[PDB]
Amino acid sequence: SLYKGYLIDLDGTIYKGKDRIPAGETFVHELQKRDIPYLFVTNNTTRTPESVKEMLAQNFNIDTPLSTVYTATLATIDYMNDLGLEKTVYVVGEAGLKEAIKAAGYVEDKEKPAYVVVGLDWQVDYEKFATATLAIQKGAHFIGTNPDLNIPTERGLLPGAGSLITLLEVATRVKPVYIGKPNAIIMDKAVEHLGLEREELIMVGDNYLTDIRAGIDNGIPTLLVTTGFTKAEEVAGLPIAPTHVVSSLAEWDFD
Ligand SMILES: [Mg+2]
DSSP H helices, the chain, are 22-33, 49-59, 72-83, 95-103, 126-137, 161-172, 184-194, 213-216
Q: Are strands 19-20 and 15-16 parallel, antiparallel or unpaired?
A: antiparallel
d(CA 208, CA 232): 11
Lateral strand order in the sheet of 38-42: 69-71, 38-42, 5-8, 201-205, 222-225, 244-246
Distance in angstroms between the alpha carbons of the first and the last residue of the chain: 4
d(CA 251, CA 23): 9
**PDB experimental method:** X-ray
Count other C-beta atoms under 10 Å from residue 219's C-beta: 12
Residue 78 annotated as catalytic: no
Three-state SS at 252: coil
d(CA 101, CA 115): 11
d(CA 149, CA 163): 5
**DSSP string of 160-175?**
-HHHHHHHHHHHHT--
Question: How many contiguous H segments (helices) and E segments (strands) does the chain have?
Answer: 8, 15
Count other C-beta atoms under 10 Å from residue 188's C-beta: 14
Dist. CA 10 → ligand 1 center (Å): 6
Pick from 218, 243, 211, 225: nearest CA to 147: 211
Catalytic residue among 11, 121, 148, 206: 11
- Output the CA torsion 113→116→117→121 (10° steps): 100
How is domain 1-85+179-255 classified at the architecture level of CATH? 3-Layer(aba) Sandwich (3.40)
Q: Give domain limits for the chain.
A: 1-85+179-255, 86-178
Residue 11 annotated as catalytic: yes
- Fold agreement (1-85+179-255, 86-178): yes
Ligand 1 ion: Cβ-proximal residues, 5 Å cutoff: 9, 11-12, 206-207
Match domain 86-178 to its CATH number in 3.90.550.10, 3.40.50.1000, 2.40.50.180, 3.40.50.720: 3.40.50.1000
- Output the CA torsion 238→241→247→253 (10° steps): -170
d(CA 223, CA 230): 12
